[PDB]
């Protein structure tokens, strides 16, 4: 899809997920964007 999905500055319309609580059952859709806390602290913050 180089001919149809190419842009000089790079398209940001395409995203993917890297972190979540656990794996996915077959044919499961996840749309949630809630923050993912990892170490110990409660986060609940936009970044950090």
């Amino acid at each position: 899809s180089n001919k149809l999905d190419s842009k000089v500055s790079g398209n940001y319309n395409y995203l993917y997920r890297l972190f979540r609580k656990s794996n996915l059952k077959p044919f499961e859709r996840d749309i949630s964007t809630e923050i993912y806390q990892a170490g110990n602290k409660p986060c609940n913050g936009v970044a950090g």
Binding site: F19, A38, G39
Partner: protein, 48 residues
């Protein structure tokens, strides 16, 4: 991470580490300004 004197940019000090357990847990305890932005691996994974 607690060495008294660092090295010049052109003569960076390199240390090889092997034959240990790697407790990345005690790395995230400093007064802010802590830029941690990796590549090629999940921050989480690192520990497995």
């Amino acid at each position: 991470f607690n060495a008294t004197r660092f090295a010049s940019v052109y003569a960076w000090n390199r240390k090889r580490i092997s034959n240990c357990v790697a407790d990345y847990s005690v790395l995230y305890n400093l007064a802010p300004f802590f830029t941690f932005k990796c590549y090629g691996v999940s921050p989480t994974k690192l520990n497995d």
